[PDB]
Design a protein around this ligand. Sequence first.
Ligand code: NA
Length: 131
Amino acid sequence: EERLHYQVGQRALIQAMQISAMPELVEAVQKRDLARIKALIDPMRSFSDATYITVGDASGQRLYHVNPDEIGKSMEGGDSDEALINAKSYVSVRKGSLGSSLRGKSPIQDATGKVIGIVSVGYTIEQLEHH
Ligand code: NA
């Protein structure tokens, strides 16, 4: 019965699962084509009500972030291991550079199931429109 913005986390998780399963994103990540990834994610970032979307490679190095300088740097929050190593999809909460946020995380996988990256869709808590 104890909740931490349950509906927001479910919305984030659903979106991360959907984005991570896109064949075009799987291909762009395999090729490490940054511009292609940006072209695919920007419109989704614009359309979603999420605060941000981050895409990382298999080692957790960012291939996309809303802040340009973060691209090429490692996701050091410590809450990406279960997706990157164990291919789990889940809701996580953490204060990264963009503030305390609820994240939906899901691995990006090739056709054989190998994890090749991660998608994190986040909602910064202080910015939620309360009900
Ligand atoms: Na996934």
